[PDB]
Write a protein that binds this ligand. Structure first.
Ligand SMILES: [Zn+2]
Ligand SMILES: [Zn+2]
Lengths: 365, 365
């Protein structure tokens, strides 16, 4: 059968899904389970199922395909023409799992704090929990020289539900005791340009995305609150008044503002939507325009493999090149989760008072 | 508990849901079942659940609230301040049920056509099915002087699935036999500005929306193809070559283009997404800017019931007035289903060759 190209809205859905690590990929070898890496034969783009060898729509999501339908496939789309999407998706999937293990580790330590110690830190201030950074997602592509993005994805059922449950529990504990985490940012753009970098972290090269061009293996980055801990003029009352998150972000249970983390994994801050939005969803702090670039080579391949009339029929005015240029302009809206535009605007403490280092995530009073 | 206003993205979600007739409404009298109309006590706005007496967020979708939670309620938001949203939602809900009954009736009649009658019409041309317009959703607010938008909503489970199934089935039948429906439009904008109205249809006044100032009880509007039907020089071959839908919309099974209907109910064309989008979803042809107006009174009420700083905290700089004005400019993107901007642009027959009348929906060859 002859097939048609997907429409622009379907490609936008593909891109947005890749940056949540939720693209549904089918490979002959693994079926629809992408736990084990394999070259994609089909990808779900919005409501369509698309053949990755011609970029033709071969079915719908509602039809539940279990094989690649026979069709007249031009076979012009090469793996290299869409691997940037596969890469962004798989790396985001690994990154979300790593971030979950980290948030869960912090939650567990906080949950194990004895009442006496909590009571003491609330009163006199002081360290409450510290996580050896070498214990954060150790065997991942972000921390081990022996791992790669093509490694298997850790099997985690209900990933987003878990991320929501743990982040919510962790922040409510922080909020109720006016505690201080060193792994949060009021505006993650400051991680890329703004914060002072200390020690080994001064060498950090931020790509501000998930692509194959540069190194995603790096240390765990957090704030160095060493000076705050020992400043005799900035004790517990000072910390409660200005430093605890609620002062800048609003009380967690009564705020729509997003809370971002420092670059814990992949040199990429995570952004969590606020509790009042109804869920604490987690997204990588990547610009919409950077996400759109993942299909730049695919647009070139489509332009070379498909006739101009067929491209217009599916993508509209100006074809796929036109769709791409229009989307680049609309990216701040159509390729950007609301959470990424909901950081606090009235700051009292902020992100520029202490440097960021490669080191242990911690919570103090 | 103290409550805060919903954020702007949540209000946009509320509006988009109202124009799909899918707002979840809670009332003390009926619980979360809006089959029977009651004054709303809460409405789901995105992931938040909002008290309609103060417009404060009292919970989340995930918490599965069973009743209005105890909270510090200003009690200053009045029913009149948000009834425009309730009205758009309930009327759209009645309208979708009516459109479903109409599409099912046409599908049913098409399936009852004898093989011989179909063969004859395909070969010689002629009327195939004609639905007495007085039989289209006769007891609804769109057809009876004794009905009102506040009447009960017909109980229809899996409404969208049925709309998809019946529209898909009907169009495959029309496409496979190169048939001609008189209830389709290539660009529904022409219903309001473009088509010639014939006979009593000249009395029609289109509000282009669903609001209380509108008079939505009206006749069923379709094209008057009588001249085409009775002109021997515009016979079967002529109709197959130019008039059957595929010539303008592309073959149904191989097209992303939306197909709209004439104003069958409520003087409001329906827009169905194309099969290649993956589903045939149905939406009323209403502009995003018109949808946004449903909260104009609510914004004014919030501006007087809530302090400026609390409004800024939830809605962002500019407050709710700023949000409203910005959303008005973003409406083509954020309050407009993709289907409403996917009509064909290369037309051979089009919408302006025959007048629109109040009369019987029909399919002929
Ligand atoms: Zn193919
Ligand atoms: Zn209230």
């Amino acid at each position: 059968m002859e097939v048609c190209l997907p429409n622009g809205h379907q490609v936008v859905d593909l891109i947005n899904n890749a940056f949540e690590g939720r693209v549904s990929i089918y490979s002959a070898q693994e079926g629809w389970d992408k736990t084990i890496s394999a070259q994609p034969d089909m990808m779900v783009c919005g409501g369509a199922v698309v053949c990755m060898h011609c970029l033709g729509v071969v079915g719908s999501l509602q039809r539940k395909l279990k094989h690649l339908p026979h069709h007249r496939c031009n076979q012009q789309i090469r793996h290299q023409d869409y691997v940037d999407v596969q890469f962004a998706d798989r790396v985001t999937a690994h990154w979300k799992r790593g971030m979950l293990s980290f948030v869960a580790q912090m939650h567990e330590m906080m949950n194990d704090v004895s009442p006496d110690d909590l009571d003491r830190v609330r009163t006199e201030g002081g360290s409450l929990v510290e996580l050896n950074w070498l214990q954060v997602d150790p065997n991942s592509m972000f921390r081990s020289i022996h791992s790669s993005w093509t490694d298997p994805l850790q099997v985690v059922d209900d990933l987003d539900t878990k991320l929501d449950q743990y982040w919510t529990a962790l922040n409510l504990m922080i909020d109720s005791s006016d505690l201080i985490p060193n792994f949060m940012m009021r505006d993650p753009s400051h991680a890329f340009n703004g914060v002072k970098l200390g020690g080994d972290a001064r060498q950090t090269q931020f790509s501000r995305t998930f692509d194959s061009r540069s190194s995603l293996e790096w240390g765990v980055m957090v704030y160095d609150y060493s000076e705050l801990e020992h400043d005799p003029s900035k004790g517990r009352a000072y910390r409660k008044e200005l430093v605890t998150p609620a002062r800048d972000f609003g009380h967690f249970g009564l705020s729509h503002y997003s809370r971002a983390t420092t670059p814990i994994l992949g040199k990429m801050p995570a952004v969590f939507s606020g509790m009042l939005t109804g869920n604490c969803k987690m997204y990588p702090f990547i610009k919409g325009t950077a996400k759109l670039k993942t299909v730049r080579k695919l647009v070139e391949a489509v332009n070379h493999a498909w006739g101009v009339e067929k491209i217009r029929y599916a993508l509209g005015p100006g074809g796929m090149t036109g769709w791409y240029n229009r989307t680049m302009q609309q990216a701040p809206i159509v390729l950007t989760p609301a959470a990424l535009t909901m950081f606090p605007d009235t700051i009292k403490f902020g992100d520029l008072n202490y440097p960021v280092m490669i080191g242990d995530p911690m919570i103090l009073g």
